[PDB]
Amino acid sequence: TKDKYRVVYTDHQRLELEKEFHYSRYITIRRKSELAANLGLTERQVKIWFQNRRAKERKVNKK
DNA sequence: TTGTGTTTTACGACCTC
DNA sequence: GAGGTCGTAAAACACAA
């Protein structure tokens, strides 16, 4: 768990994550571990962010 | 500045596998 | 039991009023 109470991710951190997301919708356990390490976040955070991004996409698509 | 509507992290519940 | 969606909180944001 990750607590007090949410962090803002840097413009760079977001950029990499968007790029990776365009590379593939679902991140591999390997990739997850690369990305976390290069971006200065946790594996869990990277997991979660990818889950939120997919929900955002579903939400934009419904609209 | 603050009211407000939208986005962004992060969770817990339940589901699938 | 790892991850998944999905509904939700609250903090951060945009920015017109």
Round to whole Å and give the CA distance between A18 and A41: 15
Distance A60 CA to B13 C1' (A): 24
Distance A38 CA to C14 C1' (A): 30
| Resolution, expressed in angstroms to one decimal | 3.2
For CA atoms A60, A42, A9, A28, the dihedral sign is: negative
Backbone angles phi, psi at A60, to 5 degrees: -60, -40
Round to whole Å and give the CA distance between A55 and A5: 21
The hierarchical CATH code for the domain A1-63 is: 1.10.10.60
DSSP-derived letter for residue A10 is: P
Is A32:A46 a contact under the CB 8 Å cutoff?
yes
Which residues, in sequence order, are CB contacts of A43 under 8 Å at separation 6+? A32, A33, A36
Residue A9, classified by CB atoms within 10 Å of its CB into exposed (0-12), middle (13-18) or buried (19+), is middle
The answer to whether the C-beta of A12 is closer than 7 A to strand B is no
Which token pair is A27? 């991140």
